[PDB]
Amino acid sequence: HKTKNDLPSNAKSTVIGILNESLASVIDLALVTKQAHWNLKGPQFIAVHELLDTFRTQLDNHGDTIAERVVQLGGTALGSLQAVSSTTKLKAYPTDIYKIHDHLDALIERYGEVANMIRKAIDDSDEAGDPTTADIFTAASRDLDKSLWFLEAHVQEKS
Amino acid sequence: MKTHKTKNDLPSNAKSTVIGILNESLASVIDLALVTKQAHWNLKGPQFIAVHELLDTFRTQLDNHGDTIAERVVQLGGTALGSLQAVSSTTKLKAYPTDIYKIHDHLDALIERYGEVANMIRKAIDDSDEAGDPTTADIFTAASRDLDKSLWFLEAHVQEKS
Amino acid sequence: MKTHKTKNDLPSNAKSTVIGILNESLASVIDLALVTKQAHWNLKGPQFIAVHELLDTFRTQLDNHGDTIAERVVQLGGTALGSLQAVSSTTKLKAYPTDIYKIHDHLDALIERYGEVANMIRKAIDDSDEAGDPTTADIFTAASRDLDKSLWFLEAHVQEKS
Amino acid sequence: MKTHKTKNDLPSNAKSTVIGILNESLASVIDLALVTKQAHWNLKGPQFIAVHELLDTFRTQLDNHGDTIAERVVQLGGTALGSLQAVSSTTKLKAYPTDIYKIHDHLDALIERYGEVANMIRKAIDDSDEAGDPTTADIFTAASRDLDKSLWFLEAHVQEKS
Amino acid sequence: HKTKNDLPSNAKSTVIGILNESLASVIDLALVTKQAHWNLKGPQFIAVHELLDTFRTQLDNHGDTIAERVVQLGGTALGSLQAVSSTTKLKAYPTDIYKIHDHLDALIERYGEVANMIRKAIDDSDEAGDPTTADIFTAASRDLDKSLWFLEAHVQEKS
Amino acid sequence: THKTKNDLPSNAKSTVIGILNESLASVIDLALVTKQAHWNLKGPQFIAVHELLDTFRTQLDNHGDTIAERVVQLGGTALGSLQAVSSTTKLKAYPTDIYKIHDHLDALIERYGEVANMIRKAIDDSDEAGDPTTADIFTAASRDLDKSLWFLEAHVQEKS
Amino acid sequence: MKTHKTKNDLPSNAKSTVIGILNESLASVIDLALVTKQAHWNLKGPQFIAVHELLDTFRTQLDNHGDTIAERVVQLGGTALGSLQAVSSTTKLKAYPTDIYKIHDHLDALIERYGEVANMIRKAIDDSDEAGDPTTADIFTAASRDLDKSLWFLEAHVQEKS
Amino acid sequence: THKTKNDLPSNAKSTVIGILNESLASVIDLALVTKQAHWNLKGPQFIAVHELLDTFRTQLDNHGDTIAERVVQLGGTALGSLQAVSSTTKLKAYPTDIYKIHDHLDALIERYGEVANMIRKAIDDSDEAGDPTTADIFTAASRDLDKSLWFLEAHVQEKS
Amino acid sequence: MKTHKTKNDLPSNAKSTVIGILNESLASVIDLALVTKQAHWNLKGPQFIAVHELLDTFRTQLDNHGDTIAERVVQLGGTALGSLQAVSSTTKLKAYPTDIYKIHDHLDALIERYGEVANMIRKAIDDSDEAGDPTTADIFTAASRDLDKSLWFLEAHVQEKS
Amino acid sequence: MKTHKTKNDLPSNAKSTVIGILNESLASVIDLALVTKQAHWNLKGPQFIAVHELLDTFRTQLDNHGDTIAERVVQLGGTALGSLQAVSSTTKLKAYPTDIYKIHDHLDALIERYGEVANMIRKAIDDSDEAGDPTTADIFTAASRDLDKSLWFLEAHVQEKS
Amino acid sequence: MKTHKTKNDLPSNAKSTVIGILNESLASVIDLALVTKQAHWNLKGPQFIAVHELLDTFRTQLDNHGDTIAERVVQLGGTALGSLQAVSSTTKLKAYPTDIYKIHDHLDALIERYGEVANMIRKAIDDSDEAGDPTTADIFTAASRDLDKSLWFLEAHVQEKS
Amino acid sequence: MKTHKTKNDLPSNAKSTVIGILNESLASVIDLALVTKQAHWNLKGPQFIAVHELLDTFRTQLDNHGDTIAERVVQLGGTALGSLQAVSSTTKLKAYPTDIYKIHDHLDALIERYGEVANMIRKAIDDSDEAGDPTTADIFTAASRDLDKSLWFLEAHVQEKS
Ligand SMILES: [Fe+3]
Ligand SMILES: [Fe+3]
Ligand SMILES: [Fe+3]
Ligand SMILES: [Fe+3]
Ligand SMILES: [Fe+3]
Ligand SMILES: [Fe+3]
Ligand SMILES: [Fe+3]
Ligand SMILES: [Fe+3]
Ligand SMILES: [Fe+3]
Ligand SMILES: [Fe+3]
Ligand SMILES: [Fe+3]
Ligand SMILES: [Fe+3]
């Protein structure tokens, strides 16, 4: 499949791997956010339940932008169940936790991991000579870092 | 209270039966709507604004299902009974306490009443279908989906303490 | 029930007086909201759809003014009293007839009750202002504007026959 | 015509039965949609604007139910039959009078046709459920809820004369 | 975790399994719909690309309704990457197809499987004495059967 | 001087300005009439007729503004003040002592029918002066005025 | 049927002529609206979704132009004739085939029928202007713009094969 | 008879009807004035002043309707026809031969200031008659009229 | 380029004539849209923001009329000619100055070009109607209404100095 | 600074008095707007998201009441004083702590400051009415309604601990 | 063409360099916008409506980026050059063929030009950053994201044939 | 104050550097937001309405950028400093004059302050990038694009005098 897009061939290759790696952990994190959303229980239920839906919409939008960029560079976006299981960097989410603080701890671990993977991806994409992909990761980084603060702010003090 | 003439051909015996089921449910749904605002105004505690605002969503839903149920009484040739006196004589809910304020207090009182109305509407689906009115049973099924979801949102605030 | 501490500095005797005015008005406004839907569902006659739909706009208005009155009770450190039992013990409205159907019969019944509530709210403006609480008086003035317009809409339907 | 292959695993005998029920209902729902606009344009009398406008809301609902019924035929591998000739050969409604103008005369003509289509769709829910197709029965149940309410809105204009 | 919801205990158990089984295949199908959306190529690209986004929104809405019902009945909704991999009934989606007809064939297989699983779930949920859950599956069935027709209509004739 | 590059001939401009300012005065009076009736009608169809007349008033506001703006595009002065309308309207004074809905409908039907018919003539007179753009403004107004006249007459054309 | 009195002063002979033009065009526009949905449900082939959705846009436009044409008949004192029997007796379109599925086959059948209604409406503009009714000719000119654009959209799918 | 359950005393009703119908006539004239200026103004600030005056006209339409509806709630007849407005307005005839923006702003400032000041007095006279609900209608109108008068005067209060 | 076959029955010589009128107008409308943005970006002076924003509304209008004119060419079986090279060979507008900045200088330059295009479109109405195509004439009349209003808006800024 | 001439006829002594009241209140409202965002960004604890989002609603309300107060100063011929230096010189609020994070600590600090501005505005209503300016007293009454409701929303999070 | 004075402190050498980069890109983006509509009007073939409508989304995007690029020229003290003559002298695109109709023909011509502009804007990001203007580089980066996505949407229609 | 723990792995020295840059910028952006409204209320002259309205659009943008900058401080574990006292101690803007009214005098005062804040944020992009924080540099880049356009809109009102 040819493309007129003239980003260098080795920059395309490099950046497609960065993209598809991040895609898998973003899709996993999208699944995790709904898993916590459905099963959380405790005094702050409705506010955290609803917040997690806004995070899921953001993850859906950044995972679509990342996958569409793979394809613009001539690759294959890899977001099926099997590609995500083989490529995700996140540990399996616990399916036997319910308390809000337990889900906040588990989400903070994973949100922090994805936020920091995307932070790295900005630099790696820019250094590869693709500032257009680096801006896709920068936009994702701004939402991931804000979502990470929102979650951490719930546990940084007890009252 | 005159029976009204209509081309709707649901049998007369099914109409009478389901009108009773509807009006009974209507009274407890109106009382539950009043209860929901009573709690909403008077709740106090650390989760005030989120619980306050959630209760207004519930009240809109109870207004919509109470209206669909009352309209169905009239479609079947009956009289919808939703005045203050009808609600007082027919509601199945215990009087709501007017001297509670803590959020957890209101949540326990709301869960009692939401669970009673949720379960009443779950029975009304089966009773309406068995009386031979699946259109009325579908009205109650839509109400049951929102009452079971609302009962879950209330209970999930107290099922764990952290 | 218990009084709540607040930084709001309206004098305590003014708070006590105006909470009584607001809770009294709240019970009749909630009863009038129930009456509005009772008529909405059961009226029948040549202008059915227009009058049926108009009454839904009136019910939304009553819901918004009832909410603003109740919230004001609580801002002044009181307990808003809007449960079925509080409304039944405090409403000034006569029980609404459940055996009427003609539009003109509902209009008469509604005009009587809308008039009573419009005039109650009119007096509440003045009583609130004399107690030194123009903020509460403005809540009642906003409600009075809507109640007097709604009363006019109802009466204009029966003031002429053609 | 011809049967189209689908992965949809509703049994073939149930598909054939329910396609017949859906296309039969589609023809009377399309005729009723044309009837609704025929009456809407030609209404004359004191109740004109509200009845004229209400009939457009009913037309939009009949368009949406008729589209849902037709799409279900095709989902099951059939051919939806909604052309002028299919509707003429399959409708159960008597020709609408083109020489009536008084609103009461259109209301009675509409009540007869709306009653027939409401009651046809009421039976379609049970026939579809008996065939083992609750998905199609739900399409007819949603239609029934709007037909029964529309029938009540029509009849409520003539059940009382004031 | 108690609930006032009085559906019988054995109906709750039965229906939670039906729900969580369907949840896994619906989430897998949601992933598949975006995998095809990103990678399809051919003359009908934009129309099929855009249609698949509407299907994904529908699957997101029915998977949320199914998962929230599990929890209303006192269960645990199971939608993490690992729960979906262990419970999905769909075969791995091919990651090396691009032609629109290849993706339509693969989506038709999977949409047909999920549509037919949900059709069964209506009956099983109703027979268990839970018409409120059966209506959740009925609403999903109407969208799955329409989406299945939309996909099949593209291949039922060649012009 | 209201010098413009618009090349419609100067005599056509002056002819069409007069047609537009005459219609503007009767449209503004009819807009005042519509609210006068709206506020004071009483009877069984009150809310439906009350709300309908507000839709008619918005339409008259939009056509009156399009007619006035066209006068100014053609180099004229739009004449829509209270005194201009009193000296140019063709409508008879609306009665201020009627309340029954049927009495307002008869009074509105007379005045709506006069304005609808003046606008119908204005299409042809503007086209015949060689200004089909102004004729289109009046055609758009005639479609609304004729529809509004039918909605009013439909209420009185049969007794029930 | 009967003619209704109106203050509208279009001359009586022009009213009679244009009512005939309007009711004639109304019948073919309503039949084209039915055809457009018939094709839409039963289309099969690679450009399914785009053509299916486009035909829904065309049906909304035909609904709005048919309503504008009908409403003009009544403004001029006539009776709008849009029932199933009136459409059957007056339509100029040939019966739409119910056994075609391929999208190119629906496109050819739609192009024949849209071309006929576009050319009928083009002629209606000049016949209405000849009768001295530019207001009615504008209704038809608005319809002609949408019909000629919709005919080009259909024909542009078949004028080239790649 | 316009018998109502509204219990404002009959003498207060008649006093406040007169205040409302007097203000209604000057508000309707000012709404006509606002469009008269809007159509015919010419000069460097054309589009901004042209569009602002449409916002003012919508506000006058809404206050005039609230004032008229209050007359009828109190058992009166709202008087807003062309002839009622000509016999009751307090505004001087607007000039039809002015075009410069500064000339329209001066003419509008005179008339906006008169209506703003009549409405200011109407608040107190309605409250003193024992009708704070009608006083609130005039207070809402005064807030818009005083803001509109400031927007007009701000254009002329400094030269640049 | 080549002629396209269509069912549209406007006579072939009329089609040919009106395609020439439409393509000629299209080139000057596209050049005027470019000129409108050139002025929008570069104007400077005391009424900058109001005039800058107004020109964006004019550009959207020119875009919509340019699109309607071009689409009409193609409906009549022609080829719409809107590329940079077609516009350069067919525009009637003089090159816009790139070294002006004062608002009054841009207004003068725009008034000249808006006047030329408004007057071209005015003549196109008549030429289209004389060729027997009132549908195309109505496209030009809609554009003329917007062009004559936009010309007035521009000229009203310079017709007085205060 | 300088006073500007206006046709507004509120007496000159009333204008001077109310301009002082307005500018005084403007300074404390702008400082409260800054405080509300200071707390919002730095809140930490279990009810983070609900309190964070609620404070944004309060900031929009303070922006709209501060703008209405400032605009009234200028309507009366004065100079609105809302710059950083004017706020610093005129605010009645104590400096907000920048080293607090726990949500209960921000709630106590916000309650002190919202209570002060609510009570200042309550007094401003009566001082404006005493000066003979009911139009200005209405601006402050509208602000008082939102300040008293926002103060209750803050205090209701701390009046009970569960 | 005068240089305009501004407080913006980007160095003069960077301003001059980036103004040239912007104006060059502006000319090819305007030509590409014209090309996009040229194709949109004249395309014919089986995927007509989907491709026709997609091209209008592209044209809106090119209008938005062309505007942001031209505005940045002026912010840096330059003259935006977007007239017909400037575009003709500066565009890098070959003249678009006016005698092609097949969708695949238009797609190949569009992909050539979209690829040239996409690649020009990709270079402009780096050239603007290296000239020391990351704010301008961000304008080009936003444009590059939409041009690369649009180039992909065009190429994905021809990268496979089924 | 104190540092909050976060999983955010931007190096600690980069976090400290960039928190200083963000809080310094926040104080001048808040002061500029207050300046913008100070000028907006007190403008007098022929250009009043369009300048008054434009300044509210700039205020909304400064609110949104200032919120984004403050939130980034907290994301990095810092304390956002936006209270009246922090702004007074940290702003780089000279006090805005309260005794100017002519629009040209406010435009020059605004141009000075907007220029200073545009140029401060331009340097913040490069300082943040030098610290290894492109996420924070993008926040300042988005702010820069709106500050530079707002500065050009202000300066374009005074760069020419006609
Ligand atoms: Fe996408
Ligand atoms: Fe209802
Ligand atoms: Fe509330
Ligand atoms: Fe459909
Ligand atoms: Fe959910
Ligand atoms: Fe206008
Ligand atoms: Fe209609
Ligand atoms: Fe009104
Ligand atoms: Fe187009
Ligand atoms: Fe303001
Ligand atoms: Fe722009
Ligand atoms: Fe924020």
From Swiss-Prot, chains B, C, D, G, I, J, K, L:
Binding site for Fe cation: H40, D67, E71
Subcellular location as annotated: Cytoplasm
E.C. number: 1.16.-.-
Catalyzed reactions: 2 Fe(2+) + H2O2 + 2 H(+) = 2 Fe(3+) + 2 H2O
Entry text on domains: 12 di-nuclear ferroxidase centers are located at the interfaces between subunits related by 2-fold symmetry axes.
Top-level taxon of origin: Bacteria
Family: Belongs to the Dps family.
Record SUPFAM superfamilies: Ferritin-like (SSF47240)
GO molecular function, one term: ferric iron binding
Entry GO terms, CC: cytoplasm
Keyword Disulfide bond attached: no
Quaternary structure and interacting proteins, as annotated: Homododecamer. The 12 subunits form a hollow sphere into which the mineral iron core of up to 500 Fe(3+) can be deposited.
Pfam families in alphabetical order: Ferritin
EC class name: oxidoreductase
Function field: Protects DNA from oxidative damage by sequestering intracellular Fe(2+) ion and storing it in the form of Fe(3+) oxyhydroxide mineral, which can be released after reduction. It efficiently inhibits hydroxyl radical production by the Fenton reaction. Does not bind DNA.
GO biological process: intracellular iron ion homeostasis
Keywords: Cytoplasm, Iron, Iron storage, Metal-binding, Oxidoreductase
InterPro entries, per database record: DPS_DNA-bd (IPR002177), DPS_DNA-bd_CS (IPR023188), Ferritin-like (IPR012347), Ferritin-like_SF (IPR009078), Ferritin_DPS_dom (IPR008331)
Protein name as catalogued: DNA protection during starvation protein
Major subcellular site: cytoplasm
From Swiss-Prot, chains F, H:
EC number(s) on file: 1.16.-.-
Residues binding Fe cation: H38, D65, E69
Keyword field: Cytoplasm, Iron, Iron storage, Metal-binding, Oxidoreductase
Primary location group: cytoplasm
Organism domain of life: Bacteria
GO biological process: intracellular iron ion homeostasis
A GO cellular component entry from the record: cytoplasm
Catalysed conversion reaction: 2 Fe(2+) + H2O2 + 2 H(+) = 2 Fe(3+) + 2 H2O
A Pfam entry, by short name: Ferritin
Localization (cell): Cytoplasm
Keyword presence, Amino-acid biosynthesis: no
Swiss-Prot/TrEMBL domain comment: 12 di-nuclear ferroxidase centers are located at the interfaces between subunits related by 2-fold symmetry axes.
Protein family membership: Belongs to the Dps family.
UniProt-listed NCBIfam families: PRK09448.1
The protein's role, per its UniProt record: Protects DNA from oxidative damage by sequestering intracellular Fe(2+) ion and storing it in the form of Fe(3+) oxyhydroxide mineral, which can be released after reduction. It efficiently inhibits hydroxyl radical production by the Fenton reaction. Does not bind DNA.
Subunit structure: Homododecamer. The 12 subunits form a hollow sphere into which the mineral iron core of up to 500 Fe(3+) can be deposited.
Name listed for the protein in its UniProt record: DNA protection during starvation protein
Gene it is expressed from: dps
